[PDB]
Amino acid sequence: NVYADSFVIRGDEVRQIAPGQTGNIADYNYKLPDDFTGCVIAWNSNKLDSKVSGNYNYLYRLFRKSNLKPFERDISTEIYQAGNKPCNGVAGFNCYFPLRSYSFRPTYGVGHQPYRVVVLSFELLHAPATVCGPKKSTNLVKNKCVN
Amino acid sequence: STIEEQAKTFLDKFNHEAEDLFYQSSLASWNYNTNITEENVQNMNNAGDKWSAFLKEQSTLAQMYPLQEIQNLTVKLQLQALQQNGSSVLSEDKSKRLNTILNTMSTIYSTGKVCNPDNPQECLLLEPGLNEIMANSLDYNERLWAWESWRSEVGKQLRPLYEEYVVLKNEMARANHYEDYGDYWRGDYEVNGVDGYDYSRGQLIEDVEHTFEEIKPLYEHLHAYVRAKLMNAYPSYISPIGCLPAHLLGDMWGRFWTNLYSLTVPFGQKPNIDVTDAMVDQAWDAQRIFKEAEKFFVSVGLPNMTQGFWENSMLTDPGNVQKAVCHPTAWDLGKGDFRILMCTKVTMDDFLTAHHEMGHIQYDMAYAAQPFLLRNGANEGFHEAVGEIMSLSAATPKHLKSIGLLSPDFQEDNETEINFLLKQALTIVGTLPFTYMLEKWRWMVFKGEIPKDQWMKKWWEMKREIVGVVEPVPHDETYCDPASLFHVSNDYSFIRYYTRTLYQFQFQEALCQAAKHEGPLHKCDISNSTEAGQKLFNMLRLGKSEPWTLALENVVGAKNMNVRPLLNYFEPLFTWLKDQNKNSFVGWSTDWSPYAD
Numbered sequence: 036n037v038y039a040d041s042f043v044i045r046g047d048e049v050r051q052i053a054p055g056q057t058g059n060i061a062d063y064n065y066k067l068p069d070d071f072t073g074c075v076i077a078w079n080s081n082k083l084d085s086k087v088s089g090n091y092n093y094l095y096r097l098f099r100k101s102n103l104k105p106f107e108r109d110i111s112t113e114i115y116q117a118g119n120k121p122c123n124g125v126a127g128f129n130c131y132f133p134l135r136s137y138s139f140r141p142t143y144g145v146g147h148q149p150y151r152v153v154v155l156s157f158e159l160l161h162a163p164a165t166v167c168g169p170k171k172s173t174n175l176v177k178n179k180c181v182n
Numbered sequence: 183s184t185i186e187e188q189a190k191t192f193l194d195k196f197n198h199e200a201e202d203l204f205y206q207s208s209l210a211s212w213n214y215n216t217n218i219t220e221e222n223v224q225n226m227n228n229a230g231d232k233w234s235a236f237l238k239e240q241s242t243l244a245q246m247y248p249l250q251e252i253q254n255l256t257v258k259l260q261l262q263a264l265q266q267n268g269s270s271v272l273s274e275d276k277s278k279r280l281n282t283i284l285n286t287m288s289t290i291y292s293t294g295k296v297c298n299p300d301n302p303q304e305c306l307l308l309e310p311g312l313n314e315i316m317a318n319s320l321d322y323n324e325r326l327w328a329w330e331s332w333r334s335e336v337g338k339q340l341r342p343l344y345e346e347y348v349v350l351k352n353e354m355a356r357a358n359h360y361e362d363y364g365d366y367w368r369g370d371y372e373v374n375g376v377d378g379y380d381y382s383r384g385q386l387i388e389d390v391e392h393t394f395e396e397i398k399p400l401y402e403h404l405h406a407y408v409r410a411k412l413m414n415a416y417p418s419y420i421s422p423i424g425c426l427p428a429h430l431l432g433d434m435w436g437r438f439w440t441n442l443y444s445l446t447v448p449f450g451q452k453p454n455i456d457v458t459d460a461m462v463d464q465a466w467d468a469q470r471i472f473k474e475a476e477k478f479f480v481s482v483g484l485p486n487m488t489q490g491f492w493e494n495s496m497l498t499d500p501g502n503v504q505k506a507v508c509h510p511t512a513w514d515l516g517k518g519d520f521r522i523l524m525c526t527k528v529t530m531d532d533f534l535t536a537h538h539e540m541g542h543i544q545y546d547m548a549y550a551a552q553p554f555l556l557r558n559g560a561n562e563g564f565h566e567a568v569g570e571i572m573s574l575s576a577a578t579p580k581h582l583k584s585i586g587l588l589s590p591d592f593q594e595d596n597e598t599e600i601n602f603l604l605k606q607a608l609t610i611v612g613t614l615p616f617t618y619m620l621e622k623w624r625w626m627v628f629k630g631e632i633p634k635d636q637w638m639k640k641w642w643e644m645k646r647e648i649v650g651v652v653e654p655v656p657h658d659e660t661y662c663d664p665a666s667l668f669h670v671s672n673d674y675s676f677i678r679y680y681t682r683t684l685y686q687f688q689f690q691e692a693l694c695q696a697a698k699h700e701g702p703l704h705k706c707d708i709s710n711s712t713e714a715g716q717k718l719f720n721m722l723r724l725g726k727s728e729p730w731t732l733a734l735e736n737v738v739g740a741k742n743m744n745v746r747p748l749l750n751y752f753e754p755l756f757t758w759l760k761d762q763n764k765n766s767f768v769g770w771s772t773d774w775s776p777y778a779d
């Protein structure tokens with residue numbers, strides 16, 4: 036099995052994705068469990084994914100009832116309930132919106148530049164392994180006792 | 183069901199939506215300050231209106247539940263700094279009247295201009311028109327002429343606008359439950375709830391007096407040395423038992439006494455040596471100055487400066503294609519963007535103010551982990567106070583030898599240090615009694631224990647006894663003098679430029695003794711010294727999420743202001759000035775107006 040998960044975060048939040056960490060992202064956006072099976076890859080992408088008028092494409096969830104079970108996608112963006120009262124769609128106070136946006140710009144500091152992160156979660160099954168490593172060698176000789 | 187929970191969610195959305203809008207406003211104003219176009223003016227004003235309307239909406243949302251059920255003080259401090267409304271609960275006519283008063287008071291002062299004695303063609307505005315003739319001249323008559331011409335014009339017309347200003351500001355202050363608007367000015371020093379660290383708004387004022395009372399005799403041992411050294415300067419207008427005539431201090435309305443130095447230089451052919459020509463001679467550049475300024479903060483062991491700061495800052499004027507504002511300012515744009523705006527030339531003074539602004543930049547770098555409501559100094563006076571001490575470290579001669587800007591064979595003796603201490607004491611000492619006097623005056627007038635028919639009397643009733651200054655030309659109730667000063671008309675509090683001084687002379691006392699220095703405090707520096715930087719950065723990183731007294735105890739281990747190291751910084755000056763003033767009288771008599779002359 037290979038699972039390639041992918042997203043783009045701020046710079047300073049790139050340490051919140053590891054076995055153990057909690058905060059905004061691990062609790063409300065992307066839960067990675069504390070004994071997972073792969074590697075985490077990231078690299079800085081501020082020269083590409085931002086422009087001088089900003090870029091308000093990338094979003095993130097900033098509100099939830101509870102945490103995530105690890106590896107659980109959620110997309111439901113209905114209006115959050117904070118206070119003890121009905122909401123029925125209508126809002127203004129103690130009914131806030133759970134999706135916030137990003138505002139990447141190419142004048143920022145390192146702590147806010149958009150980093151590209153890909154998660155490789157891999158393991159075996161009892162099925163035949165459809166993913167091996169490298170082999171290697173040198174050359175082929177003839178008429179010689181060789182191993 | 184509780185209360186802290188909804189406040190937590192409200193703050194969690196409010197920070198996220200506030201830092202974005204503030205970045206929009208800050209980048210707009212920076213782009214105006216680099217390049218002067220009216221398009222940038224209208225974009226900056228639209229950004230400011232967006233950011234102000236957002237603050238208005240969140241604040242009027244916030245008052246639906248009181249502060250009284252928050253027991254995590256990080257949230258309660260934020261909602262207490264948020265929940266004040268002001269003129270929104272005031273009515274629709276009075277706010278427009280108040281803004282009209284503020285605009286008129288600013289435009290009479292700022293755009294004002296007084297003419298000559300019969301010429302429309304050469305008329306003098308304030309800066310730099312009126313200021314030079316009172317800055318460096320010797321005729322008593324034209325200094326009296328300008329000193330009368332400014333106030334007799336401007337203050338009389340600002341007087342009824344000031345009456346309307348105080349009568350509206352007092353009702354506005356009682357509409358926000360601070361009786362005596364000066365108490366509303368003291369409310370930023372109010373600390374409550376943190377036991378063993380508590381404070382009060384009434385506890386402040388006498389503390390200022392209880393910090394002034396030790397500054398007194400040194401000042402007179404300064405002042406007589408000033409006054410007798412005006413004997414050979416203006417050799418008719420000296421009362422050796424008396425105050426000072428207030429148009430002779432080499433400047434405007436009695437705040438800085440630097441321009442007397444060329445008269446009051448003690449030692450003739452032993453100059454206070456400036457090293458600007460040294461940078462001129464061996465091939466320097468504007469960039470090398472700020473490179474060495476970063477090299478100083480490596481030497482204390484602090485964080486370095488981001489590449490995005492060196493990328494888009496401005497450290498050289500654009501020549502002449504564009505018109506650029508060069509008033510040197512450290513600009514924290516927010517969101518990890520820090521820049522420095524300056525039109526630096528090859529000068530030792532630009533080296534020194536480069537360190538003075540870079541200290542501000544380091545202070546902005548330090549607390550950038552707080553909520554957006556709590557990103558500032560812990561009180562109003564800390565920021566310039568931590569900005570100052572890098573200049574005091576960088577002016578040291580051994581620091582100039584270690585950076586190759588002074589030949590390492592050069593010796594230093596006492597007369598150089600006495601000249602240096604005098605040219606420092608003209609800056610530091612002279613501001614304190616005048617600042618105390620002006621803040622005391624405005625506090626009293628806001629208190630309403632001085633009605634409208636004693637104002638321009640009571641000013642001079644303080645000005646002779648506390649500052650040691652007598653007016654030269656009689657004033658009646660046509661005038662209004664405390665309004666001839668820039669921070670009075672522009673509604674700026676003036677208290678901070680007192681307290682700053684006291685704060686700075688605690689800090690050089692506490693940091694620079696920890697780097698194990700020998701000898702006096704005036705030859706001290708933090709260089710190649712890591713524990714000093716650790717002790718400092720444990721204070722700069724805090725923010726304002728704590729009481730400011732805890733942030734003071736983090737450095738010095740006291741909760742107050744002590745002028746006694748200010749005594750220790752000024753020792754050799756004082757112990758030589760006593761043998762100077764051995765042939766004079768100290769103090770002043772208070773009768774002596776020079777129209778009872």
Ligand SMILES: *[C@@H]1O[C@H](CO)[C@@H](O[C@@H]2O[C@H](CO)[C@@H](O)[C@H](O)[C@H]2NC(C)=O)[C@H](O)[C@H]1NC(C)=O
Nearest residue numbers: 213214216217218219221222500502503504505
């Ligand atoms: C001051 O800045 C403004 C905008 O930053 C410049 O005005 C125009 O900027 C656009 C870029 O969006 C250029 O395409 C135009 O050519 C600029 N106008 C002109 C008349 O050149 C402006 O040029 C700057 N000031 C100076 C003196 O260059």
Ligand SMILES: *[C@@H]1O[C@H](CO)[C@@H](O)[C@H](O)[C@H]1NC(C)=O
Nearest residue numbers: 190193253254255256257553
């Ligand atoms: C509340 O206080 C605790 C410790 O007293 C701290 O962990 C927490 O961050 C505080 N709450 C907020 C919103 O900062």
Ligand SMILES: *[C@@H]1O[C@H](CO)[C@@H](O)[C@H](O)[C@H]1NC(C)=O
Nearest residue numbers: 473476477480484485486487
């Ligand atoms: C900081 O920059 C200086 C050069 O200005 C360099 O000598 C020093 O090693 C740097 N330190 C760090 C932590 O980057």
Ligand SMILES: *[C@@H]1O[C@H](CO)[C@@H](O)[C@H](O)[C@H]1NC(C)=O
Nearest residue numbers: 594595596597598600754758
């Ligand atoms: C300056 O120092 C020298 C060297 O000790 C000393 O002889 C001289 O008296 C000092 N002068 C003053 C004014 O202190």
